């Protein structure tokens, strides 16, 4: 959709993979504020907001914290902190037509600058003059919106750019959004370190006879010692035995 009517999707309770974002090369900008792109899969996020729109290339500088411009002032405002990433890629082939692509519009005129993360879908005629406008278009009455007018041949600056903004609302609230944690192969009867289910430990892993149900993830015994656990990848229960040690 257009920049003034920017689409918002609420994203939560998922395994948020960002490897696809890294792998693709068609993208132009991965500008991230308050967060490291390589560690997106590492942290857990309370909630994600996906803002999708299409902008002019020369205006991609206005999608940034503490920035000013017609798009920034009247179309889309980004907070100064904004722990999140703006990802923009050129879309000249997809979003330009023979003649003019007038389907996409931006708001020329507005009474005041909109607050961060505010959407103004109003189509009321703006009164630039002293005389009351009363819903007509005149010398000082102007339609707020105006089309991009994309052509097949256009300057890089004036060619369309598809932009997606990620509003990562960090909070102590339940972490709905978490990156993939990756995994490793299992190891048979040998003294190894392990981090099953987040439980760090050292020992040998043996196939066991202890049995239980999904009411459990990991096992223990007397004196609060972990001596069994099911691996998440196989749901197989293994005894943890301390690595061989003793005096000499």
């Amino acid at each position, epitope marked *: 959709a257009s920049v003034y009517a920017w689409n918002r999707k609420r994203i939560s309770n998922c395994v948020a993979d960002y490897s696809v974002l890294y792998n693709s090369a068609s993208f132009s900008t991965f500008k991230c504020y308050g967060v490291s792109p390589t560690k997106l899969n590492d942290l857990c996020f309370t909630n994600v907001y996906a803002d999708s729109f299409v902008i002019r290339g020369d205006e991609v500088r206005q999608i940034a914290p503490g920035q000013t411009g*017609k798009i920034a002032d009247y179309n889309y405002k980004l907070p100064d902190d904004f722990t999140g990433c703006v990802i923009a890629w050129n879309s000249n082939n997809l979003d330009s037509k*023979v*003649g*003019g692509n*007038y389907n996409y519009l931006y708001r*020329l*005129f507005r009474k005041s600058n909109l607050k961060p993360f505010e959407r103004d879908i109003s189509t009321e*005629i703006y009164q*630039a003059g002293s*005389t009351p406008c*009363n*819903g*007509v*278009e*005149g*010398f000082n*009455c*102007y339609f707020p919106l*105006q089309s991009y*007018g994309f*052509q*097949p*041949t256009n300057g890089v600056g004036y060619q369309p750019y598809r932009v997606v903004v990620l509003s990562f609302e960090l909070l102590h609230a339940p972490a709905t959004v978490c990156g993939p944690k990756k995994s490793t192969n299992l190891v048979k009867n040998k003294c190894v370190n392990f981090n099953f289910n987040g439980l760090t430990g050292t020992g040998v892993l043996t196939e066991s006879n202890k049995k239980f149900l999904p009411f459990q993830q990991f096992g223990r015994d007397i004196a609060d010692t972990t001596d069994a656990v099911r691996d998440p990848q196989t749901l197989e229960i293994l005894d943890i035995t301390p690595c061989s040690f003793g005096g000499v």
Partner: antibody
Amino acid sequence: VQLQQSAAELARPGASVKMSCKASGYTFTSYTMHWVKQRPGQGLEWIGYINPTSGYTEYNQNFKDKTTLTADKSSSTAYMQLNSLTSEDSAVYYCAREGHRVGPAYWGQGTLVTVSA
Amino acid sequence: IVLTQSPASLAVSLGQRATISCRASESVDNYGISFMNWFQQTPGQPPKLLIYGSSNQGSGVPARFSGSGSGTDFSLNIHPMEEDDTAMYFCQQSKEVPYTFGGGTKLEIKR
């Protein structure tokens, strides 16, 4: 958005001419409307405009006295009144609609008015 | 505001650049944007909106037409000139109440 005017009216000097411009394809209530003259083989000169909803007309100093600008929202049309016609008034006139930040944005055909005895 | 239109009668061959220049007594840019407007009129037809603003192209306008400029200086570039381009081209200023047009340029195919 289409504009249909009258056709080639003939008047003697000293008479009065009332002529019409109907507009279709749009509201006709949300756009101010402009009038333009053009003498044969000459430049284009704007006369004046009106807001259809409120009877506010603005004319040039040149055309303030002799020109009268009216509109009818019920029939969605426009009317020109020319009084005390002279030889210089013989020309082709153009009916213009507001749009795209332009005063005379959309132009409709034209009326050839000839003032001679 | 008075508009002066340099060359107002230009003849170039088909497929060649056709440039018409427009200047104003005062500045044409207001509210950031530019209020220079560009029209085309063929014989027997009323003028049509072609270029609104300094650079933005009008509805039903080929990519051949290109308007550019700022302040008081504006230009029309016509690189792939076609047969239909033979017409009279006009300037317009929209900031002030008195609407004044340019000189008017009749474009003809050169042979």
